Amino acid sequence: MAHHHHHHNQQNKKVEGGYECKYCTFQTPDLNMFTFHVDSEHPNVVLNSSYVCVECNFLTKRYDALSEHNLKYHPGEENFKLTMVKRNNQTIFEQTINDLTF
Numbered sequence: 001m002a003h004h005h006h007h008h009n010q011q012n013k014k015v016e017g018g019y020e021c022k023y024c025t026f027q028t029p030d031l032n033m034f035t036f037h038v039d040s041e042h043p044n045v046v047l048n049s050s051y052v053c054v055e056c057n058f059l060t061k062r063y064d065a066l067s068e069h070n071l072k073y074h075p076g077e078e079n080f081k082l083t084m085v086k087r088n089n090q091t092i093f094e095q096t097i098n099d100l101t102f
């Protein structure tokens, strides 16, 4: 199919500026508000496989948000690494930077 782009608009919020949870379509650039609403609504989340910015400890529903992350969120360079270590929660791939970690 050539594809008819239409149904994507407002379906995908992507990630704009902040921490978008994997489990919710709400986002906040405030880590406190992020972890607050997380602890409140999704304190223990376990599922299958996803990416989290280890740096920010934020799980998102798309690997993309981690990719644009060092682009806009942790700007300076673009070099993210992947490591799967997520304890208490599920085992999900945490994506850390080798530089923008500071």
Ligand SMILES: [Zn+2]
Binding pocket: 020, 021, 022, 023, 024, 025, 026, 037, 038
């Ligand atoms: Zn959330």
Ligand SMILES: [Zn+2]
Binding pocket: 053, 054, 055, 056, 057, 069, 073, 074
């Ligand atoms: Zn981050």
